[PDB]
Design a protein around this ligand. Structure first.
Ligand SMILES: [Mn+2]
Length: 231
């Protein structure tokens, strides 16, 4: 089977989420064929060169699972879009761009964090366009680490989750040639049927781990998303 998770927002001061995640790795990810993490895995990320003990311990826990043979794919979210190849190398995972189309038991399936669909938040979209400009990424990777912390504090202060724009879903799905989309970000776990030019399709939204854990599990026969307690 394959597992999909997102929006864990891992951080040292949330040891309940961490414990839930490491137990999920031991009891479920180890036995799966693949694990996909669709963004906002960490609550924030200043860059791989800023990793602390907590973040390194998470990489080491992923690496145990990858060494066991489970394929781990990590996609950026908006909170942790600076995660780099050095982190992924420690963790044994593959960085997946947003968007990516994967083959899922023979079906092409679109994966995204989801915030790119939330086009009605105009302010959010302006910030996102600045943050992902290649020139901004160039300058950020040339900023000293202490200055990146100063910027992160500034952005945190100068700033509830606006949901996806309905018409964007069929537009992007048709553009990638898929009838199944999986994303996170909106904190509204659900499966949405829809139409694409008269044809049925489906959008699956992953749950966030603030109050309970979540996982979507898929195999050739079916799929299910269900929560589980943090404690
Ligand atoms: Mn997000």
């Amino acid at each position: 089977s394959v597992l999909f998770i997102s929006d864990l927002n891992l951080e040292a001061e949330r040891p309940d989420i961490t414990r839930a995640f490491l137990s999920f790795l031991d009891e479920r990810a180890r036995r799966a064929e693949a694990l996909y993490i669709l963004g906002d895995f960490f609550e924030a990320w200043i860059g791989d060169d800023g990793m602390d003990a907590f973040q390194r311990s998470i990489a080491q826990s992923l690496r145990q699972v990858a060494d066991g043979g489970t394929r781990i794919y990590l996609m950026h979210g908006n909170r942790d879009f600076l995660i780099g190849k050095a982190f992924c190398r420690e963790a044994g995972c593959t960085l997946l761009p947003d968007p990516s189309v994967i083959d899922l038991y023979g079906e092409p399936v679109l994966l995204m964090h989801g915030d790119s669909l939330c086009t009605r938040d105009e302010a959010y979209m302006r910030l996102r366009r600045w943050l992902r400009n290649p020139l901004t990424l160039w300058v950020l990777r040339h900023l000293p680490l202490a200055t990146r912390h100063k910027l992160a504090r500034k952005l945190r202060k100068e700033s509830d989750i606006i949901d996806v724009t309905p018409e964007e879903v069929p537009r992007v799905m048709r553009g990638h040639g898929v009838r199944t989309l999986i994303h996170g970000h909106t904190h509204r776990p659900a499966e949405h049927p829809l139409d694409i030019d008269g044809q049925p399709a489906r959008r699956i939204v992953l749950g966030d781990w603030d109050r309970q854990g979540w996982a979507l599990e898929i195999d050739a026969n079916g799929h299910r998303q269900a929560p589980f307690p943090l404690l």
